[PDB]
Amino acid sequence: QGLIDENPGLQLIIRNFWSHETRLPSNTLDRLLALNSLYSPKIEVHFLSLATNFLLEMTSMSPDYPNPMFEHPLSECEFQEYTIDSDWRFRSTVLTPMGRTDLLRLRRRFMRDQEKLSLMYARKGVAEQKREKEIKSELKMKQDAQVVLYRSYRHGDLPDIQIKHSSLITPLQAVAQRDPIIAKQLFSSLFSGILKEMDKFKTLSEKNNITQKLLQDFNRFLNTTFSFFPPFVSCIQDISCQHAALLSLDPAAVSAGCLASLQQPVGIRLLEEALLRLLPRLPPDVLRWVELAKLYRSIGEYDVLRGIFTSEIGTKQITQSALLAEARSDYSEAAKQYDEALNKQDWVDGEPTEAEKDFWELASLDCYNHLAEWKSLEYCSTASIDSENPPDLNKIWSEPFYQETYLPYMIRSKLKLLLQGEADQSLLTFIDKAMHGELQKAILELHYSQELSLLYLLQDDVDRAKYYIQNGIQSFMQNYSSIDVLLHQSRLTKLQSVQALTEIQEFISFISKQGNLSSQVPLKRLLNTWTNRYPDAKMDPMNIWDDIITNRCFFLSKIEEKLTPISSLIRSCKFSMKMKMIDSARKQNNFSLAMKLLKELHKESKTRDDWLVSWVQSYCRLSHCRSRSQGCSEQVLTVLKTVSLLDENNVSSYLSKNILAFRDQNILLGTTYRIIANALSSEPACLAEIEEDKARRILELSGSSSEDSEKVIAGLYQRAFQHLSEAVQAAEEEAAGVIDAYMTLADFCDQQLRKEEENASVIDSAELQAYPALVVEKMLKALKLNSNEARLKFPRLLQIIERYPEETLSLMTKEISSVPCWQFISWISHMVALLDKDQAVAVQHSVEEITDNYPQAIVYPFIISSES
């Protein structure tokens, strides 16, 4: 433990202790096997540097050490030596153009007037009072900027290649000491080298022994560590991959360690090589595959998972179905499957391996986590720990599987069960009891700062809040600089938490300035800021989105409590921000969470009208999206039976209050009808009679008065189109959705025309006569804006032109009349081809313009098309 001590002096002394000859052996391999013993959990964050330092400083006394690395210089140039100044100064700091002698000292008198002498020391003392003041001011800069070089730096008119071996192994050690990723590379390389050159020295009998010794030692490493410093965990695995027979590292141990260390991929490769190599005789080897499954689930690549379990290797198909569900984020169905899985009484073909149960549990806990059923979360997180019904939470720190798999969810559960509303005091008891024992304390303080911070803040002890959250910021810095640069997905999962930390920091700092407490302006300031700062929508998982939503909720509750002697404004933010969370969840295909949040936030619909229309809009949007995924017959229930009813404007004159809604709601009703009609046409043979009563009863009312069989679909589409038209005429009132609404009407027309070309509907075509006219005159109208998605489908234009010839004139006279020619250059080729046949009257003016403006584009395709 001393090997890291704060004083540099004792650092050197203890290290020199441990490097003397009789303590660690003097040859290399005996050193490498020894350093495994020089480790403890607490020496971790430096252990890599320490090992490197030991190894190299034994290199230091080898005979080639002063022998220059390259025998000859590269010229005859004369070489000088110059020192570098380095006087606690940087570069942008100075403004530009400025003994029988000694016996003699006994010849002294002494001031006699103690008053005078007293004044003399008094002034002297104020002099040192100022001197100490300035030296304290300067010593901070001096601690920052003190730099010690490490080699000679001979100068010559050419490079001084002839550097002593020292001149490279010593700097390398310096860097290794000071930064840990270079430590990982150095230790990894050097360990690989030593264990590779061991061949030329010891027979296979010895090699088996030393390799087994390392394997034991490394398994100890991983299984005993608590800090989970990403570099060391990575280094140990990375060593293990590039040598055989280190590869049988305890699969569970590696899995847990990598899950925690946020450095998954190296672990994936470890277990990968394990699988392929140790089995080029137990066929299944479940204990490895399943933990690989755990890893790939971490890295979020549910795609590869689909491979592992469909191999008839041990695992049971219940897990397969669970995975298929949970890939589509249908986390509710996933939970149901898993819960039924873990509670199977008797199996066919053998009970699930010790490890499949583990994976099942972890997936259960996580699957709940993606959900808002956090009471269920806590119950799951606590049940397995002990025997009696009122759970002895203290047991969690007993044996490691819980410590790594059950804890984090336990603590996160209890935290929010607190921070939402109110609850008991289990967690305060738990954490307080925990925070006695040493390793006990270290786990919480190093990993879970962001949670202990909120816990303590609930108790209104702001000071401990500051300490913990500062620790969290430092911890993030340390465990982020550590993560190797290439692992983007890892670093991303890191950053997703800086928002949490900063939010906590801001609240603490906001309940610290009573000047910002008693007024009212800066509450508005903070509310406005949080209103428009959000996590990334399409990327950041909902397990952080809920973190920000709930944190902010609690913090507003506390601020409201402070400013009791407003609530309008706080409610406003709560509406808006939770609504944004629903919108997000809608994007991520995390539907069940969206269900729950809608249902939790409807009761706030009754209030003034903008939130009413917003809620109804969002719910219908979500219903549409849910329908898109699944359901073919019953899906009509998923929209029609409710969404039609809800969307009715009888509850809202807000269109008379604003126009944005007067676009949004209409497009919503449009798409509402659209899927209805699409699926009704899908397999009409078994819909109206299968949704036999109430939906059907609604259908004709939604359709036309005549209850005819086939014509009901057209009755739908007719009002559908007129409604989408209402949407567009809404759009023409001042890209937000207008490009999208335009494209939307486009798409309705497109599908309808495609369907029409496969049959003969005289009346539907007669009312269709508008459809192509609009598709051209309006889609191309939309092509003016960037409209990338539109610009792509421009061949659909020309084809529409051809097959439906009478209304070409609109094309020319309307929009090719106004196209920005480049927005056709993209595939100028096709129409310059089409430039012969009768419709060529179409591209005429466009090809002319692009010819003039950007001639060199047309030439190459045009020259060939000329021949035809």
Binding site: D339, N343, K357, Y368, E373, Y379
Partner: peptide, 12 residues
């Protein structure tokens, strides 16, 4: 559906 569990013994 309610979420239920039971204890487990780790065989080590």
């Amino acid at each position: 559906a309610p979420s239920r569990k039971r204890r487990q013994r780790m065989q080590r």
